[PDB]
Amino acid sequence: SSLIVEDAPDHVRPYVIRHYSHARAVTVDTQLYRFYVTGPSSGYAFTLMGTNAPHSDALGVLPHIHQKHYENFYCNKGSFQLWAQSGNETQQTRVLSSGDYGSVPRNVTHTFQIQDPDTEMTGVIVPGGFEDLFYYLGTNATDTTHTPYIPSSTTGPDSSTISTLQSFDVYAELSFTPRTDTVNGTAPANTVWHTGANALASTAGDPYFIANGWGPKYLNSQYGYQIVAPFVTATQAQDTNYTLSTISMSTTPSTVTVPTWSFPGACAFQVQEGRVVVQIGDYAATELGSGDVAFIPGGVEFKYYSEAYFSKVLFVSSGSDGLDQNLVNGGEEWSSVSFPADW
Amino acid sequence: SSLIVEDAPDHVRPYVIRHYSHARAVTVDTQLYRFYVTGPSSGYAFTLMGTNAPHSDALGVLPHIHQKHYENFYCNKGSFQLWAQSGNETQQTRVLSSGDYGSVPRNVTHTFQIQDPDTEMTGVIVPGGFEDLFYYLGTNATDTTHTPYIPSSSTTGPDSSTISTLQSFDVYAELSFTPRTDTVNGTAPANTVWHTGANALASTAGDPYFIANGWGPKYLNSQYGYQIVAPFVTATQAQDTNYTLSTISMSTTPSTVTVPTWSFPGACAFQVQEGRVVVQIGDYAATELGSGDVAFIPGGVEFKYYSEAYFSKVLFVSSGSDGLDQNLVNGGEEWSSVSFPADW
Ligand SMILES: *[C@@H]1O[C@H](CO)[C@@H](O[C@@H]2O[C@H](CO)[C@@H](O)[C@H](O)[C@H]2NC(C)=O)[C@H](O)[C@H]1NC(C)=O
Ligand SMILES: *[C@@H]1O[C@H](CO)[C@@H](O[C@@H]2O[C@H](CO)[C@@H](O)[C@H](O)[C@H]2NC(C)=O)[C@H](O)[C@H]1NC(C)=O
Ligand SMILES: O=c1c(O)c(-c2ccc(O)c(O)c2)oc2cc(O)cc(O)c12
Ligand SMILES: O=c1c(O)c(-c2ccc(O)c(O)c2)oc2cc(O)cc(O)c12
Ligand SMILES: *[C@@H]1O[C@H](CO)[C@@H](O)[C@H](O)[C@H]1NC(C)=O
Ligand SMILES: *[C@@H]1O[C@H](CO)[C@@H](O)[C@H](O)[C@H]1NC(C)=O
Ligand SMILES: *[C@@H]1O[C@H](CO)[C@@H](O)[C@H](O)[C@H]1NC(C)=O
Ligand SMILES: *[C@@H]1O[C@H](CO)[C@@H](O)[C@H](O)[C@H]1NC(C)=O
Ligand SMILES: *[C@@H]1O[C@H](CO)[C@@H](O)[C@H](O)[C@H]1NC(C)=O
Ligand SMILES: *[C@@H]1O[C@H](CO)[C@@H](O)[C@H](O)[C@H]1NC(C)=O
Ligand SMILES: *[C@@H]1O[C@H](CO)[C@@H](O)[C@H](O)[C@H]1NC(C)=O
Ligand SMILES: [Cu+2]
Ligand SMILES: [Cu+2]
């Protein structure tokens, strides 16, 4: 029919959805949510959503936990503060700016606050279907012009109502007090934020944060150069059974055949920088730019390559051995965000 | 010949140059410079260059002044700190992250330091031709794969002896400048506004100033779909350097609105920051630009542009006082959001 769709399909199929497409949009006060990948569109594998919002002096949501969902916060642009705490571990907070990442495993108390005027948060939540919460809390938005968001109490449900959302896997943590001793975008002191390497948490269940470019990286040289920066591996996902990362890409040299991939689990990516061509199943090849999302059903063959000299995508895969993990296993440890200057 | 080029042309003509094209690449230590618009390519109107670099614990250049060039620093991605001081005024510094902007007029002392691993600075320097300095001090880079910078603590670039010798290049050393070290939350001195509130352009020419992404003044133009101009340099600050600089954010063009043709006295250019923008210049094919791609339009050449993405943002520069950004401002209204209205 058409590979490109304006809202996520109501069933599993190859699709691309452009940045700021309608995507069943709702607003929650000033925040505008778009559901690029849903439970029905992914066969319940994962939800990929974008939230665009203006600066707020108040929290963007009351503190809460998910018992059954793993949540991932990625800052596409602008900035937002994220607070997280597992059990009786020290409360952590970071101010995420463009390309920064925050990991929120099951049973981790969290909240966020939108700082900059042009802020966009990409949420990847596993398993899929978590969006039903926003269908309830939000008000449908026609947003005819596709504007990123519509131009101080805490945003969202009040204390009574947030304590009423257990059926959507939201559990209130009303006694949680977000720490107020942030300095240079982090607290407590003696955390590393934009000043040094960030490791993935070695302990399952603990939150962690990776500043843009400061996490572990792997160079794969098999099909041109690709650099995988892991955000979630089997160590962290455990039974939620997924991977999450960015993949950075060179062009494919004309002497290299662009490979054909197929994996048992669904996967998806959102372009962050550059221009990436995707050919999925029997559909025409389509070039994606900033914020565009490609979705590939499990078991469907696909090909992708970068038309830009350098592109970076945020990538999610259902399963323990999707594309990013395959590229890591076929690659080597690498200490740069740039690939070699020679083939 | 063809619209799309791998290095900027050697004479004035319409062209498009893709992000990370060769663009007469040079390195200076760890920094890789690319010259998307040059003096010769713009008829000396302006230079638009991109510098990609990894984190450094040292300054990216020794402190210095330009007497005849106005420098503009825009953070495409990553982050870098910028220091600046004019005459008798207090020394200012900000840590710029994606979409942030720092203005450095003639006769303002300045230096910078690269903070994050994947940092990209776009420099717009007026008038054009300043890039000779980077040819001269730089080392030619072939960069076959077009990698953003070459993978790999003294101050980067010329030593103090060398930088005191570069007057011909309009570089004057300020070796007694001490970059302030009391940065907190990305700014010093403490009594400044950075990512916490509105930023104004300088009240007059000659003074440095900084605009954090989304926090400067904005104007909505509704004549051709919705466009939001966020000025960075106006006639007030440019004076005789005679240019304007801003971002322009764009909606799609509604089917009932004709995409306008423009033809300006002076050369103009833009680099896409977010989104997908089609440009149709002269008799060349409509061409779609993505992140970091640059379009250059000579004065006197007709062109049309529109956004294929639902929202695009470009960094825009024009020679003259009445280029595209100022035209859209004059035809528009003050506006307090980085988003345009939800209805046409
Ligand atoms: C640096 O920025 C942080 C915000 O990230 C400031 O922390 C705030 O401090 C005030 C006053 O103590 C508190 O009431 C707020 O709740 C704090 N915010 C957060 C999120 O921690 C801090 O004041 C700034 N430091 C300086 C010197 O400007
Ligand atoms: C917050 O970040 C700033 C840098 O932006 C740190 O500033 C440095 O502080 C050290 C020790 O005082 C100085 O030696 C450096 O010269 C400073 N750098 C700059 C660029 O000003 C600051 O220490 C950080 N604050 C905290 C409490 O961690
Ligand atoms: O439970 C909630 C939640 O998780 C998130 C969220 C938002 C953006 C993301 O990118 C993300 O990963 C999660 O927002 C909310 C907003 C509300 O008003 C109420 C909620 O209960 C949540
Ligand atoms: O004079 C100089 C200068 O201005 C800049 C510069 C760099 C990036 C920008 O984006 C910009 O606007 C200016 O770098 C330099 C680097 C050197 O090694 C020596 C110099 O003399 C300069
Ligand atoms: C999360 O906490 C709940 C309630 O205490 C517990 O039943 C559950 O096993 C925990 N889940 C995980 C994945 O740790
Ligand atoms: C909001 O949109 C959904 C999805 O189309 C629809 O089911 C629902 O009825 C809408 N709500 C209202 C109140 O119209
Ligand atoms: C993980 O997901 C993959 C792909 O969806 C699937 O093949 C596999 O059965 C899953 N494994 C587990 C342990 O559930
Ligand atoms: C810059 O300083 C030089 C040397 O003092 C002076 O001659 C020149 O006129 C100044 N230019 C401007 C625009 O202020
Ligand atoms: C700055 O201060 C000095 C004296 O310290 C003075 O000579 C100079 O004229 C002042 N600058 C201006 C522009 O007034
Ligand atoms: C050009 O660059 C190379 C390294 O890329 C350097 O060795 C060489 O001297 C430079 N100049 C010439 C004349 O090739
Ligand atoms: C300013 O630039 C415009 C466009 O290039 C040019 O036509 C005009 O002559 C310039 N004005 C002055 C006084 O330099
Ligand atoms: Cu949550
Ligand atoms: Cu300079």
UniProtKB/Swiss-Prot annotation, chain A:
For this UniProt record, give its keywords in alphabetical order, as a comma-separated list: Copper, Dioxygenase, Glycoprotein, Metal-binding, Oxidoreductase, Repeat
Task: Tell me the segments the record calls region Cupin 2.
Answer: 199-343
Cofactors that this protein relies on: Cu cation
User: Activity regulation here?
Assistant: Inhibited by diethyldithiocarbamate and kojic acid.
Please list where the region (Cupin 1) is annotated.
1-143
Instruction: Give the pathway annotation.
Output: Flavonoid metabolism; quercetin degradation
Q: Does the keyword Membrane apply?
A: no
Which residues take part in binding Cu cation? 64, 66, 71, 110
| Stretch list, region Disordered | 146-160
Establish whether keyword Lyase is in the entry: no
Q: How is it modified after translation?
A: The N-linked glycan at Asn-184 consists of Man(5)-GlcNAc(2).
Q: How does it assemble?
A: Homodimer.
Its annotated function is as follows: Performs the first step in the degradation of the flavonoid quercetin by a dioxygenase reaction. The enzyme catalyzes the cleavage of the O-heteroaromatic ring of the flavonol quercetin yielding the depside 2-protocatechuoyl-phloroglucinol carboxylic acid and carbon monoxide. This involves the remarkable dioxygenolytic cleavage of two carbon-carbon bonds.
Can you name this protein?
A: Quercetin 2,3-dioxygenase
- Tell me what organism the protein belongs to: Aspergillus japonicus
Q: What is the lineage of its organism?
A: Eukaryota, Fungi, Dikarya, Ascomycota, Pezizomycotina
Curated annotation (Swiss-Prot), chain B:
Q: Residue ranges of region Cupin 2?
A: 200-344
Binding-site list for Cu cation: 64, 66, 71, 110
Gene Ontology MF term list: metal ion binding; quercetin 2,3-dioxygenase activity
What is the required cofactor set for this protein?
Answer: Cu cation
Mark out the compositionally biased spans (Low complexity).
150-161
Keyword vocabulary terms for this entry: Copper, Dioxygenase, Glycoprotein, Metal-binding, Oxidoreductase, Repeat
What is the free-text note on the cofactor?
Answer: Binds 1 copper ion per subunit.
Report the catalytic activity.
Answer: quercetin + O2 = 2-(3,4-dihydroxybenzoyloxy)-4,6-dihydroxybenzoate + CO
How is this protein's activity controlled? Answer: Inhibited by diethyldithiocarbamate and kojic acid.
Region (Cupin 1), start-end ranges: 1-143
Pathway the protein acts in: Flavonoid metabolism; quercetin degradation
| EC numbers for this chain | 1.13.11.24
Looking up InterPro entries in the UniProt record yields: Flavonoid_dioxygenase-like, RmlC-like_jellyroll, RmlC_Cupin_sf
- UniProt binding sites for substrate: 64, 71
In residue numbers, the region (Disordered) covers 146-161
Top EC group: oxidoreductase
**Span list, region Linker:** 144-199
The superkingdom of the source organism is: Eukaryota
Q: How is it modified after translation?
A: The N-linked glycan at Asn-185 consists of Man(5)-GlcNAc(2).
Q: Does the keyword Transport apply?
A: no
UniProt-annotated glycosylation sites, renumbered to this chain:
88, 107, 140, 185, 242
Assembly information from the UniProt record: Homodimer.
Q: What does this protein do?
A: Performs the first step in the degradation of the flavonoid quercetin by a dioxygenase reaction. The enzyme catalyzes the cleavage of the O-heteroaromatic ring of the flavonol quercetin yielding the depside 2-protocatechuoyl-phloroglucinol carboxylic acid and carbon monoxide. This involves the remarkable dioxygenolytic cleavage of two carbon-carbon bonds.
Question: What name does this protein carry?
Answer: Quercetin 2,3-dioxygenase
